[PDB]
Symmetry: D3
Subunit: 244 residues, 6 copies
Amino acid sequence: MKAKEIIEFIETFAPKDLAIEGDNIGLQVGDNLDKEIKKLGIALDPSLSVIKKAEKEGVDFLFTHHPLLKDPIRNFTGVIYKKLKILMENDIILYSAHTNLDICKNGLNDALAELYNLENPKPLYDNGLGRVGIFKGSFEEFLEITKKYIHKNPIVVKSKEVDDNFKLAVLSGYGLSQSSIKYVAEKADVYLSGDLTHHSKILAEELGLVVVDATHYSTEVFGLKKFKEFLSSNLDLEIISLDF
Amino acid sequence: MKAKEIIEFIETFAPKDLAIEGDNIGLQVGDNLDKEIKKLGIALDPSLSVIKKAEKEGVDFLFTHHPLLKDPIRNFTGVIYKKLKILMENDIILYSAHTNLDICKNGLNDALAELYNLENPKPLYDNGLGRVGIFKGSFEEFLEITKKYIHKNPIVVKSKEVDDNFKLAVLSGYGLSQSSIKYVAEKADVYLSGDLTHHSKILAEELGLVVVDATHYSTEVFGLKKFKEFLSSNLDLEIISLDF
Amino acid sequence: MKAKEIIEFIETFAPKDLAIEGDNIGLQVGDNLDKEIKKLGIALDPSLSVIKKAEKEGVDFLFTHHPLLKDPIRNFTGVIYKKLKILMENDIILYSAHTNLDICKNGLNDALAELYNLENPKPLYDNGLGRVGIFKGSFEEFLEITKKYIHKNPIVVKSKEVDDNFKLAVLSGYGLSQSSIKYVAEKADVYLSGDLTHHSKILAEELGLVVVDATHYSTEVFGLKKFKEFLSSNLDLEIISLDF
Amino acid sequence: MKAKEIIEFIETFAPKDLAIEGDNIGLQVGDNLDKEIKKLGIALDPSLSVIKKAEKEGVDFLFTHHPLLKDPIRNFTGVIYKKLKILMENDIILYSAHTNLDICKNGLNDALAELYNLENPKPLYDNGLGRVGIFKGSFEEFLEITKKYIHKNPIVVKSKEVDDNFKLAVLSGYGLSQSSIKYVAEKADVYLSGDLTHHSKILAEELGLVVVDATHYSTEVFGLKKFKEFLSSNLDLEIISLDF
Amino acid sequence: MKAKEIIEFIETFAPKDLAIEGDNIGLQVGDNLDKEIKKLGIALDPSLSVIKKAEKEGVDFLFTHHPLLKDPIRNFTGVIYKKLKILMENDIILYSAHTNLDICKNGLNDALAELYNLENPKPLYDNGLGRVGIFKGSFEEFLEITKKYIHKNPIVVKSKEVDDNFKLAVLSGYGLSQSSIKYVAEKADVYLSGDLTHHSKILAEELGLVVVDATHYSTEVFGLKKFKEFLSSNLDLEIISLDF
Amino acid sequence: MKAKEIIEFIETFAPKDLAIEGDNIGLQVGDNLDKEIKKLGIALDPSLSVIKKAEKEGVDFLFTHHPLLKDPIRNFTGVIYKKLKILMENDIILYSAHTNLDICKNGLNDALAELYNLENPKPLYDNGLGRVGIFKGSFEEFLEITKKYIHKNPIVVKSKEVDDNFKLAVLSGYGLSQSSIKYVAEKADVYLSGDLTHHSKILAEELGLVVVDATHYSTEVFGLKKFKEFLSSNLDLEIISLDF
Ligand SMILES: [Fe+3]
Ligand SMILES: [Fe+3]
Ligand SMILES: [Fe+3]
Ligand SMILES: [Fe+3]
Ligand SMILES: [Fe+3]
Ligand SMILES: [Fe+3]
């Protein structure tokens, strides 16, 4: 299996056009895409220890959810120097599917929507991040599903009492920004996502939106694990995970 | 004491000139500054519940650290309508000292710098948020001070081992943005602040910067309490706190 | 009749999408739209004396042509404090139909076009402010219609002699800006609108465009009166005008 | 007297440094500044008729307060073609002192400040358009001076009653913009300027600021006439005025 | 033949919409388009010596490929004063067809594409500057065609050896910018255009794109001559060229 | 000599403060500045072939005048991948002094100013690129110096005849932009620089400014060679040049 053919496979599952404007998806680091791949590594972040571990584990193709850079740079020093040095010395390909993997069908957001068995699930935003639908059950049933499958100790901002058969909004990753709370508050009773901060918490309380922070990491890894299983089932390649 | 005279007192302590560019400091809500003040309320946030509590307790002058609005509006609906309705029905004056109170001398950042008895402390940024200096002691002595005076369970990102007599940077509030971690990594071994998120955590680990999240709330309330005592000692009026 | 149902009625007559980009139309001030309305007030401007008079006259629903704010603000002091205080203390709803009422069918611009009986009238701009068509008659017939129905002492910039059966352009409100004069000069012989200034007058003379300033107030009130009659005819509500 | 030498004289009186940012002051149209000048024409506006009149009367050097263009062009058609054609066929030099002539000492704003004998006058803005000081007398004395020296029928927006010895702000030209009324309301009881429009009128009434519109034209011609006398007294050439 | 009818003819051949965004095509200088034209002048640049020569040669209508101004101005001095003076004193019309003449059918780029007999030629950019296709022959055959019909001494940046039947990209005028080299390098083996500079040369060498600079002047004049022949064949007018 | 110490030496000669706004000076590629340097390579451009040649010759520290990137990137493919791969595999340090080396004293512009023995030389721009002064001699003496020390076949745009003792402006690199010709025409009779293009040539002819294009390459290499000798004389390490 050549590198281009792995990319071709991923892009069929999660087309790059789906990614929201400005998102740095696609090839991050690499030159020869007809190179043969004997081992595939998958990770949430293209972090320094992830890349170090990929080098140690003999990874040929490194697939990450988050891009290497979101802001363009014009100097190569410090950390990015260290990262690139390892990738280039071993000719390791770095490729990312970011929001296109969040948004696509059977993607990270769909994965959560299926975990909570939402009824008539819809995209939360038009672009089309997140899912929203009815959760058929009690708040404590919802909360135990979360504790068992996502994160053992989610932070709960219990702004209000939640009735059975409530609308649950899910967004994998960083979805608890102030503008997001305001947006989702008009569309859901409970919001499951990650990366809660003070102003977002205060805002959720005022708007009566119940927010459950299951962390950025856990809400994405859940889906990423499913995607890993999908690659394993369809690709005749060694696949390992590096940070999950 | 008239409202203008309380404002004159606060502004002598924390001049508005000190606030960073774009910060919405000063009079938030109010018209007649010759109103007499029998009771002053102080709060971290001008939240709905704080304002509700201010009304219930007969607060005349409501002082908050965070501004009512950071982004301007031209319509009055939902929460902001409710807040304004209460303030205006009782003619409660809302005044804020935000970053000018972070930056001034014996301000929120100085309060932290003084708790850890930083040696030769300097402003962390040019503008001049935060403090940085040498902590005379071990990392565990630093952490035990933190647990006792600030927050019992701070999140510690222990990127590396810390020698005694290390450079400590402190910043009250939201100081754990990605750009901030990058900046502070060049100036300190340990960074104490609030509102950690995933991308910032990964970055601190890569940079070898130790980050301690004692929460946005706690790192600012510590200083706000001292300022509350300062107001009580010098003004001859009842002073109550609403969200701390 | 509930507040939402009054809004629903106005928006059927003058859809909000019709309004030009950036125009602050719609709900200005209010929270509960299922509130019952016993008295409706209509005014050109949401001025302080208009709001004071609405409070004195027991107005429940205040409808204005001009929005309360065009530029967003983040502090509530002085005049806007005074205005909001009255509106919020009496729970008076403030709603505006601005350019959507200028542009719609049988709107303020159509009203003028029908007063002058323009033949084959067309929108003056593409967006689609103003009307333009042939006036069937002399300039002095046009001028006497204006003096009788719009304003007794219009300012006339008689740039040129005007033939019978000339093209008349009308724009209710502020239509005598420099760019507007330049635009209309290529499309009409005479331009009837409001708010003339020196540079616009000089420009009209050079371009040979005859401009008649019947004032911003009068050119809009004419149409606003018609709209008031329409609400009276169709709504079973007390309707009063506050500044006309 | 050569053109450069007239320019040198004017610029000694009203330095170009004084003009506010973006103001198109200086040489408007001209190539050879060693041309001899037998007749100098002065005007408020570089209008088509002024330039036509300049040609007819054999003006060599045309001095205007307003610039030929405020917004840049890259095509030459219509009016601007006609203007340039006349100027170039006769090699008439067009030079402007705009806001620098408003701001300088004994300039258009000083002229007004000196007519009302303002006490301890200061610049109204920081840049430093307009003047403000105490008028030693009654409002009717102020108005009678205005009617006799400036304009016989000024528009008066009598927002409130005015005590004797009030603070008067003067600004020659267009000073009655919405933002200006808001600014001046904080600094004066009465504001004298030109080019009133509807939204500015309403705002002055709300702010309790008395506004007197003596027209853009008249409030600037008053000063221009003094400057005309200054040029006659000091230059040994024929000086005529074209639009005043 | 009236001026408008010459313009109408050119615009049928090269529609103005075809021009890329921001391009200053169309009427440059002129007022009366029903003026009769007895002599037509065509030139690459509306330069001072071109305009001087047009005046001396009794040109009524001056057609240029490059516009008089690309950046708008608001002062008329120096060169532009000299140019306009001649054009306006003789009432010479200045009209330009710029990128609309580069892009249209049988335009300057098509002219080159036909000189090199490219097979299956396509627009180089989407907007739709330049042409690209297979050159049926050797590099030295290509080079001799260039030397015989375009320019005797083209600068060749021989980045690589070029095979027979290579892809040739052509762009008349300034096509050798850094971004252009990068773009074309992915689409052609050899790039024929004008205005080479150091950074563009260095870049071409790295990318292995062979660049032939036949100068901005020559690559456009070739097509301009063809267009001149077309006007001569179809218009019953005296046509002369001024700078070629 | 450690890398930091070579950097310290260069920066003493050409301070980074001197570089104009936005210029990407300093460390381009590198991580450990305590690396020992046995061989220093100097180049005009950090081109692919220069870096290839640097690797082949065992260069430890690669110093270039032009930066690696002027516009920031966030993906690593093609040429930039190849460059970084070589630099990182050998841990070759890439450092640039760009406009700061143009501007400093005895810098690239001074070198030219000193070759022509300009009298009373001053910075050409305020920032302070280029030099200008009187050349003591005839134009042919100037040209013969140019042909002997800079470039044997400079392109001369002889716009007009030049008197002896003329004002000469020199600027190493790309100084022949349209705006630059316009600027320099106001300050000098002859302008020596590099990278002439068509629109600049026409403009120089119109302005009567004599332009001599001795190429971007040659006008900068002349100074770079002197700087190379300066480094050899003061550092005790092997110094080689790669593209000159
Ligand atoms: Fe994420
Ligand atoms: Fe805060
Ligand atoms: Fe209006
Ligand atoms: Fe004016
Ligand atoms: Fe061209
Ligand atoms: Fe250079």
